[PDB]
Amino acid sequence: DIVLTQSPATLSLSPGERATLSCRASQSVRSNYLAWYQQKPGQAPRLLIYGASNRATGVPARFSGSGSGTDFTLTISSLEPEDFAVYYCQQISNSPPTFGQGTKVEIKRTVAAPSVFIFPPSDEQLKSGTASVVCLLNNFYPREAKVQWKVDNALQSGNSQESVTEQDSKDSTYSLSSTLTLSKADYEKHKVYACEVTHQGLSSPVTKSFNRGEC
Amino acid sequence: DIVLTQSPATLSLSPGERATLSCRASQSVRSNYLAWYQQKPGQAPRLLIYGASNRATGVPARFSGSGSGTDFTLTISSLEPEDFAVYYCQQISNSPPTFGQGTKVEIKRTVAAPSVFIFPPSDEQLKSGTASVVCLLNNFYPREAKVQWKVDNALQSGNSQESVTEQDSKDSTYSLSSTLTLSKADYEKHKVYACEVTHQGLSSPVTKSFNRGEC
Amino acid sequence: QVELQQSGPGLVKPSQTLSLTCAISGDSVSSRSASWSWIRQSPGRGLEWLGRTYYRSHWYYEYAQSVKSRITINPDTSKNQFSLQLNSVTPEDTAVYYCARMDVPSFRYFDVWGQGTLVTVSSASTKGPSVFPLAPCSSESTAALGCLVKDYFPEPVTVSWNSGALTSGVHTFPAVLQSSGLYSLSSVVTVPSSSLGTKTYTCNVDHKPSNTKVDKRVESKGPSVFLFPPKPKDTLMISRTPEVTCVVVDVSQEDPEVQFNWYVDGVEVHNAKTKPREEQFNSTYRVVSVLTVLHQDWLNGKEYKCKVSNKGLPSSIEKTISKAKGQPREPQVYTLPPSQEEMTKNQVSLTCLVKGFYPSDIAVEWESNGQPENNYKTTPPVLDSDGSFFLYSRLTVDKSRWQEGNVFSCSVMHEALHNHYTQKSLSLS
Amino acid sequence: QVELQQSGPGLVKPSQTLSLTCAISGDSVSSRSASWSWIRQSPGRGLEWLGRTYYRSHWYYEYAQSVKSRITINPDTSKNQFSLQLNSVTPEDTAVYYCARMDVPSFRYFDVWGQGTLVTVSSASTKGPSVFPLAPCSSTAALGCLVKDYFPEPVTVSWNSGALTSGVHTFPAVLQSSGLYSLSSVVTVPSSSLGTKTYTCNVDHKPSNTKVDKRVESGPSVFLFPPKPKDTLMISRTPEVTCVVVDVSQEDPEVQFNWYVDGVEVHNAKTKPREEQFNSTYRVVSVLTVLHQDWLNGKEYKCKVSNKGLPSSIEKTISKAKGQPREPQVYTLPPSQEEMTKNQVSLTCLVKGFYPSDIAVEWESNGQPENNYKTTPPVLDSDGSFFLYSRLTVDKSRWQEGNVFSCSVMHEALHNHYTQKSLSLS
């Protein structure tokens, strides 16, 4: 099978900048049989370029393909925030059709501090015997963030899980959830539940808390 | 002097039960000169029966006196919670008038767990150089209760005093205060002040606490 | 526009058969120009073509070597669809499966794709989710609400708010597989705090594997100024219009309407074009005022002061901009061919050294055969020990284009040049 | 109705005289059927009759044998009162004293009694109480008052001038080791009422003439700099992270620095003293030495800045750029032939395709450093890597003589963090 090696694996650039994506084939590929695809989260890949240099239907003019033989290039003349996606090259010069491993394009933007929110477990979940305490970090940039759980000022470990959204196609931010899971018994043992957030956009850590019994 | 011997010294009964109180005289007593009194906490004795068998003014029908010579009886046909009192017999058959030593009537009721409250010393007192920490056990039954003071989880000894109210005339409960006394210096040395309550009505001991500096 | 609609269960027990169907609309399964294909995607293995069925006066079938012993792709001309059958599945078959149209014999691109089916290989039974509200315990203009969706299997769930009416500010997190072997996720939304007392918020969770739809009502209890100079090219060309730009950011909704007052060498001017307030994604406002500048006025060192007044500031914010003061010095322009060591690459670098210029305001562009070349980057001007500036511009070209003898040119626009322009050519000797 | 009202001090010094008065309402002190009596009560001795005064066409007096030598009971027909005088008291006289009417010759019962006077036999001085509120630190709430360090008993405690009686518990006083009494009075009330309703304890201590009504209620900027690229790449050099605090005011307390390596506090930073700037603000710098491999492996360095005494702070965290490192390609370019008309010519070093941007570029010739150069900052390229150019100015005579010039590059992605590329006239 023909192997397609894409470079760089990740590309972080600001809107308005030119993006250059490389695809190197292990064997010569006939130009008519080299295509580029764009894949956004939760969607199938979208045909962007076919026959190495032909823009597919409805594809904006900022996207262009070039190259021949073993070296192909996808150029984004001026990046837009909605261009956040994974870009794949694909060949069918020799069967079977094969794809590259992709270049993930990340959009650079100015630093944005997260808006922090804390949610106590509902009375309904408490009756079931489990307490899930949720901390939300909303619309921040860069992706790097530190979340610390403090239960009656005592630092928590191994009882929390994090989830992060994919970069927003419009404002280029991320959001994060941190969930602290305790049994109903362990939850009723303490009063102050707090989540402490550290981020580049914050001059000092932000703490959001609630007292069990005041909810 | 004529000696009046009352039995039993204490009588513990439920409302609705019959109460039989005995008064035995050391010399024969003329029936017209034998009286019974009821004394409630903080009050003077109230004339209940005069001339061995006459109900005094405003005295309910459940109270009756009987006997002659050296043996007299006060009967409460059906005990009421407000009947909690000390009952005394008195003679004036021969001068000087003398009284019996009394029968204390206690009211039996269902078990009631105390409601526990902790009070830090006031800023006003702290200024004077003394810290009095007060623990309240409210409206409980039976009287038996254990109060333990813990200062930074360390058990206290010889620095606390207890005080109990008399049985309530309506709900037949008791209330208790436990006061922990420390110097201002010894008080500022520690953070967690706790009172642990053990009682028949509580499945497990109840702890009420405060952190000095949060008040 | 041709559509592919996928159907079939994603949850398959180990050793059993995966069966999916792709319904075609807008094209025929018997098309002599198309190949009806299946492609899977997994983290690590990436996109992997499984095979195709295609009609060329006879039905043909082609499969990837790795799955050939277990796969069948069958067309159905009565229902205009095609299926995927993958036998004896193992956890290695867990992936998102797509059907796709490979079209046009000359190009064979995949232009139309199905929505994808998440396939999970597991012996575990299907379990519908439980949904709990996320509401604050008890100043702030925006509030957050949400739903915790948990104890379900397999993935996926679809979460909506107010039956799909509420989409703005919604974040549905990726699910996490818990130690119980069940998934959990939260969906959140930020809304105006004022609306909490009157407006209702309900999350709707759809879990197609268990055929359940769960509803859960969620019940609850500055400015900065930037002043930009004109672009160097604009000031040097009489056909271009130079302008100074005053930008105000972090304007609040509560305290809007900004006052723009300009000063050319201290003299107030009233020809600026102020654009209306534009709401930003972060709920602030941005206001822009543009002042057309006279070419010679900028070049002669005139000062442009922008005064901004708003309720957010007690003292009015002022910014002043002008060209660098000092005697203008003519840039020397030299073109350098690629190094012989770079000739081993498919792409080579063409260098333009521009030095001895003052002030640092300059424009550098590249062209070939009377057309602009855009695959270049120019360094910022750098201060030299003699007080003048230098920079380099690098144009990346295909080695073939350079070797063919094509002439490339570096154009430079600076105030100290004759007619504000110079061009230097570079070609293979 | 017939009533008896008692008055007189209860505190009596040993060997001195107890004097109490009983005021009669609804009957006459001269009644031919009544005997105006005094009875005392103490734990242990119980109820004990002391004596009587009675009028039967003449005033008569009868006393208990035990007190006969020390007692007098005197009627007052002008005020309708009768007194008790008990001389030479001892601690055995400590008791509650009641006046009472003994009535009807046929029965002689005690039907009417005074309220009682608590009599304490003690040499100790009268002391008024100190009253403190009892309120929780943070459906039903409890409030109270601590009535402390008074003598003798009793005190009267009421709530809201007698309006509040339900849920009130006034505890018996306890005699402390100091010889002073202490008690608490509590009340439970609805928690909802706490915001609107006021609660006041009224403490009356008649011996000290005290009545207490106690209401029961309940700048600078920080910049954090990474090490110099050459310092992290040479084991003989010392890489360091620099924390700079600007816009410190003269009156500001000492700037304190706390440093952390992946969250772990370190104590080896070297903090320099405050320095005044030309704009009258002060600048403070703290320098932390870092280990070469820790920086290259992506460890996080945190500087926390605060002022001595004050609780607020500013924090900054730094670490190496995230992303895959890429080896720079180094190319030397000779001067343009058009530049050969000058006494000095430019030698160019193109360094491209590197990641991260942290790099060091120098020049040499004949084993000696060449210092007449300038290097552009790294420039981000369209492929996410960086490039730069370095320009060494040399005398044309030195270039034409065939001297070999070298561009040296130090970068983490190079073998041994070093590469050199030569350039000479050929």
Ligand SMILES: *[C@@H]1O[C@H](CO[C@@H]2O[C@@H](C)[C@@H](O)[C@@H](O)[C@@H]2O)[C@@H](O[C@@H]2O[C@H](CO)[C@@H](O[C@@H]3O[C@H](CO[C@H]4O[C@H](CO)[C@@H](O)[C@H](O)[C@@H]4O[C@@H]4O[C@H](CO)[C@@H](O)[C@H](O)[C@H]4NC(C)=O)[C@@H](O)[C@H](O[C@H]4O[C@H](CO)[C@@H](O)[C@H](O)[C@@H]4O)[C@@H]3O)[C@H](O)[C@H]2NC(C)=O)[C@H](O)[C@H]1NC(C)=O
């Ligand atoms: C709420 O959101 C606002 C909008 O943000 C934008 O949209 C979001 C969705 C993201 O995509 C963001 O990345 C994006 O910016 C924020 O506004 C931004 O505020 C910051 C300050 O906090 C501003 O930073 C300043 O930027 C100057 C450079 O600005 C030019 O370049 C930017 C790209 O790099 C571009 O976005 C700008 O539009 C601007 O572009 C130039 O415009 C002129 C005039 O039209 C043209 O002639 C030029 O050709 C354009 N050039 C380019 C390259 O396109 C910096 O110069 C400035 O730095 C200076 O000051 C600081 C001190 O503050 C010094 O330290 C420094 O040394 C220097 O002197 C500063 O960094 C940014 O410009 C704002 N963005 C816009 C579009 O206006 C809000 O901040 C945010 N609020 C909150 C609370 O989150």
Ligand SMILES: *[C@@H]1O[C@H](CO[C@@H]2O[C@@H](C)[C@@H](O)[C@@H](O)[C@@H]2O)[C@@H](O[C@@H]2O[C@H](CO)[C@@H](O[C@@H]3O[C@H](CO[C@H]4O[C@H](CO)[C@@H](O)[C@H](O)[C@@H]4O[C@@H]4O[C@H](CO)[C@@H](O)[C@H](O)[C@H]4NC(C)=O)[C@@H](O)[C@H](O[C@H]4O[C@H](CO)[C@@H](O)[C@H](O)[C@@H]4O)[C@@H]3O)[C@H](O)[C@H]2NC(C)=O)[C@H](O)[C@H]1NC(C)=O
């Ligand atoms: C009162 O005066 C103070 C002193 O000013 C100095 O002296 C006067 C006489 C003038 O000559 C000044 O130009 C000079 O700065 C002022 O302090 C300065 O405050 C500003 C903020 O207001 C600081 O700006 C920040 O600078 C960072 C870069 O700083 C490096 O580079 C500077 C030269 O470009 C250099 O002066 C600095 O010393 C520093 O140098 C590095 O130091 C490290 C550690 O020792 C070395 O390892 C490096 O090799 C040095 N590198 C070089 C090139 O020499 C910027 O990174 C920073 O920007 C970031 O944040 C802003 C937001 O604030 C973003 O917008 C931006 O995009 C970016 O992310 C910022 O611009 C400046 O550094 C301070 N100067 C010093 C020397 O500390 C006071 O501000 C002033 N007060 C008032 C009220 O006027």
Ligand SMILES: [Ca+2]
């Ligand atoms: Ca077709």
Ligand SMILES: [Ca+2]
């Ligand atoms: Ca390395």
